Design a protein around this ligand. Structure first.
Ligand code: CDL
Ligand code: CDL
Ligand code: HEM
Ligand code: HEM
Ligand code: SF4
Ligand code: SF4
Ligand code: SF4
Ligand code: SF4
Ligand code: SF4
Ligand code: SF4
Ligand code: SF4
Ligand code: SF4
Lengths: 216, 289, 289
């Protein structure tokens, strides 16, 4: 407990995350330009409308690949458990900035875990429906009816994921100190105590204990 | 664009900013294809390509007279052949296939690019290529599987109802060329009249289910057929029975959009009013007092 | 734009999003200027300006028949005169000058504005003025020094090969007017045939180096010449010998772009991953522990 910060995120997972964010900006905006044609400016997300049509799916694939790297590195820390119920029941209290008083928060809270699975499920849905509606490469192999359903679902999934990310960014901006941890990798012990009690308690113990195990 | 000022529908255009359409007092036109008089000569395929300056590849024979085997960016109309005994004796049903120029076009409804597809006051539905992004949404939106992408420029093409001829007073190339007069052209009102007269004659010859194919599900079409067996359109190489814009496409291009719009606006409001109402969540809101 | 759907090349357009060109099955056309039959009457200058609704200024005589002295925004073709004794006796070589309508146009290659210059399937290279920004890059990109800026609207203009006449089936104005038939017009295939027949006749008259000027360096041209002295094109008031797009222009508009693109992307990646990897450089990273 004698250090201003503690490492919350490794460089590799920070590099990935911000790669996903940049790709997502382009993919979400191009997608929105097809969804709401009145927002003409967005048809220039990838330069020209013709270019955007081509690149959207490629950058989409990149996001999926990167999110799968994130999946295998973060999933075990996002597993729902009985300790998450307390959170789910005092949501209104958590949003007022009083979560500590009402819940048991480990590495990532119950909201972050719900977001994680929402994000991971939607990118899978977007991958599958995206491939199906992809011309000229793949749409040809699918029955027209399947292509039609996929067009409906892909649009819906894309919108759901964008809403989710809006909320994910907000929260990140809201629980102050969070963005620095994702850019630099470190969180101050007090930030850990307030927003993620159980989690820091574990690092603190893992820490001290194994250093006490050495035999100072 | 809009030089003709008679554009009644335009793709990806908000309903409160309609396209220029003051010059809309024009009679609707229509092509009537009487399959009972068609001899499957393919003159229409040839005349179409000659007039339109397009040439498909030299294909292969795989056991049937049909060729090319499907519509493509270089073949805007193709004759489809069907041999059947479903009605009691051998029949060779031959049907000219290509854009139906629907009154309520699914291609235009599904298209996400402003102005890529338009509908003229006279009923012609045409592609304005400068605006096409090659997404292919129109292929799925079309109840008749008509649009085809050109690999060489990433744009879709199809029968234009010879808009370049009709616009200045002349009938389409395929219409004029038809050896037996199976294809007719004129105002839709008089083509419907000719169709009913023909149906009456077919009934008098024993075809009790002869009828006009002008599907109400798409608001009627500007390319219609007279069929010996209107009760079984599938017999004519899969012509759809009671075609309509698919329900999934209607929902996707319809209600989903404003719903998503409301969610977005409402979400932005909520988050903004939330931040302002409660304030940031920093490490210590307590030692600030 | 793209209403004709036969645009085979378009300025400042990425190679993976080609212009609309499905209607590309059209014969290439060409103008053949046989300078050995030219009488330097200037009828072509007059017919061109009359047809195109343009008038240059009333200039000055500075000692030669040439007038106007150069192509300009208001003079799309000019006769260039050369007196020489380089071949053993006095000769008056007269050549009609103007756009060559190159198969691989340097103007289009150098142009930075999308759609400002286009090439039609029939070989005509034309300027779409609505998109011209007046940068003048095309003047340097052109191996023949043809484009000219109009001071009154900041746009370039040149011979259009009378695209407005050819598009509807009529030969250019200068072609039709030529008193001696020095100018011919038709499909490029048959113009090449006429050119070779003429070269044969000139050789029979003693011009052993007579030949057709259709430069391979620019992929051939749609305005060609029959020259008495094809071994010395410079004699005809500077006509280039073996013209081609300049190497500096090819590099500038070619490899430099993707190279710069890679640098930019790579730089952005490096800087971003750098900041994240090492973190800020603040006054004390040490008392943070
Ligand atoms: C509280 C709840 C409030 C509820 C309000 C619901 C409104 C629904 C309006 C509408 O859809 O009726 C549509 C109505 C019917 O249109 P329609 O022809 O039947 O169909 C629409 C088109 O088919 C297809 O749809 P569309 O393309 O025409 O969509 C319409 C609308 C489309 O815009 C929207 O629906 C909302 C905008 C959402 C943008 C999403 C951004 C998300 C991206 C983020 C990614 C970040 C990455 C992280 C990295 O665009 C325009 O109307 C102008 C809106 C401009 C908003 C500008 C905001 C900038 C602020 C910056 C500071 O159109 C309108 O009347 C004018 C609407 C005016 C709304 C005000
Ligand atoms: C690790 C190393 C990675 C290496 C990757 C190299 C990629 C080279 C791609 C390309 O040039 O191949 C071109 C290839 C061939 O084109 P081409 O017809 O032979 O010639 C290109 C045109 O002639 C003339 O060139 P171009 O105009 O077609 O240039 C193409 C590209 C052009 O874009 C680029 O090359 C890179 C963008 C650089 C922007 C520079 C910003 C600098 C300004 C800052 C000033 C600040 C002021 C301080 C005060 O534009 C589009 O493809 C979409 C790219 C959109 C990037 C959006 C970034 C926004 C992020 C914001 C958050 O075009 C493409 O296949 C699609 C390229 C997709 C790349 C992903
Ligand atoms: C997982 C990889 C993805 C693939 C293969 C993919 C592919 C596609 C394709 C092929 C289209 C049709 C237009 C075009 O060809 O450009 C499309 C549309 C769209 N995509 Fe994706 N996409 C992917 C990911 C995403 C993601 C992550 C989002 C959300 C940010 C998204 C949102 C959209 C939207 C909103 C549309 C337009 C639907 C409409 O017009 O209503 N896509 N995508
Ligand atoms: C500019 C927008 C974004 C910001 C500011 C942002 C910020 C953050 C921060 C600060 C964290 C870690 C918080 C903590 O340490 O508890 C995080 C985690 C994460 N972010 Fe983002 N993010 C953004 C966009 C995205 C996008 C577009 C995606 C994917 C579609 C994404 C996926 C994730 C995932 C999967 C995690 C791990 C969470 C968990 O394991 O529960 N983020 N983000
Ligand atoms: S030209 Fe007429 S008769 Fe011949 S195949 Fe076409 S529609 Fe039938
Ligand atoms: S037949 Fe298809 S392509 Fe033709 S107008 Fe109807 S929906 Fe559009
Ligand atoms: S492919 Fe079809 S749906 Fe897509 S922009 Fe072109 S016309 Fe519209
Ligand atoms: S109406 Fe014109 S474009 Fe359509 S099939 Fe006939 S000839 Fe071809
Ligand atoms: S009109 Fe013919 S003869 Fe006269 S100057 Fe021009 S090219 Fe020569
Ligand atoms: S002569 Fe010059 S202006 Fe004419 S087509 Fe060739 S490069 Fe372009
Ligand atoms: S001056 Fe020439 S190079 Fe510049 S935009 Fe106009 S046509 Fe293009
Ligand atoms: S072809 Fe037409 S534009 Fe060109 S010089 Fe002749 S008359 Fe003028």
């Amino acid at each position: 407990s004698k250090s201003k910060m503690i490492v919350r995120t490794k460089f590799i997972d920070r590099a990935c995350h911000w790669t996903v964010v940049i790709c997502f900006f382009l993919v979400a905006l191009s997608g929105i330009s097809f969804f709401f044609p009145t927002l003409q400016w967005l048809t220039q997300t990838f330069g020209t409308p013709q270019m955007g049509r081509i690149l959207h799916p490629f950058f989409g694939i990149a996001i999926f690949v990167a999110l799968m790297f994130m999946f295998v590195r973060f999933v075990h820390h996002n597993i729902p458990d009985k300790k998450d119920i307390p959170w789910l029941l005092n949501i209104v209290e958590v949003l007022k900035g009083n979560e500590h008083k009402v819940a048991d928060v480990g590495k990532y809270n119950a909201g972050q875990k719900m977001m994680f699975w929402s994000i991971m499920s939607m990118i899978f849905v977007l991958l599958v429906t995206g491939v199906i509606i992809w011309r000229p490469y793949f749409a040809q192999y699918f029955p027209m009816q399947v292509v039609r359903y996929s067009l409906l679902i892909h649009a819906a999934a894309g919108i759901i994921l964008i809403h989710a990310i809006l909320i994910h960014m907000y929260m990140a901006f809201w629980v102050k100190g969070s963005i620095k941890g994702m850019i630099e990798g470190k969180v101050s012990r007090r930030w850990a105590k307030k927003h993620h009690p159980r989690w820091y308690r574990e690092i603190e113990k893992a820490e001290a204990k194994k250093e006490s195990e050495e035999g100072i | 664009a809009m030089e003709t000022q008679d554009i009644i529908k335009r793709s990806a255009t908000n309903s409160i900013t309609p396209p220029s359409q003051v010059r809309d007092y024009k009679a609707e036109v229509a092509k009537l294809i009487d399959v009972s008089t068609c001899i499957g000569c393919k003159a229409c395929q040839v005349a179409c390509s000659e007039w339109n300056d397009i040439r498909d590849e030299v294909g292969h024979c795989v056991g049937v007279y049909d060729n090319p085997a499907d519509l493509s960016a270089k073949s805007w109309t193709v004759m489809r052949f069907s041999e059947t005994e479903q009605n009691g004796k051998l029949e060779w049903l031959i049907r000219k296939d290509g854009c139906m120029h629907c009154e309520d076009p699914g291609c235009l409804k599904a298209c996400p690019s402003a102005g890529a597809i338009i509908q003229y006051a006279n009923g012609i539905v045409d592609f304005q290529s400068e605006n096409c992004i090659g997404c292919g949404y129109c292929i799925a939106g079309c109840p008749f599987n008509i649009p085809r992408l050109n690999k060489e420029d990433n744009r879709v093409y199809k029968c234009t109802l010879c808009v370049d001829r009709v616009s200045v007073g002349q009938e389409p190339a395929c219409v004029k060329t038809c050896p037996t007069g199976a294809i007719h052209f004129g105002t839709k009102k008089e083509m419907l009249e000719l169709a009913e007269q023909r149906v009456a004659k077919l009934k008098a010859r024993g075809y009790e289910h002869a009828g006009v194919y002008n599907p109400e599900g798409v608001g009627g079409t500007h390319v219609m057929y007279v069929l010996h067996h209107a009760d079984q359109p599938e017999l004519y190489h899969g012509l759809p029975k009671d075609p309509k814009i698919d329900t999934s496409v209607s929902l996707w291009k319809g209600a989903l959009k404003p719903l998503a719009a409301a969610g977005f606006i409402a979400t932005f409001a909520g988050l903004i009013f939330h931040y302002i109402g409660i304030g940031p969540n920093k490490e210590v809101d307590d030692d600030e007092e």
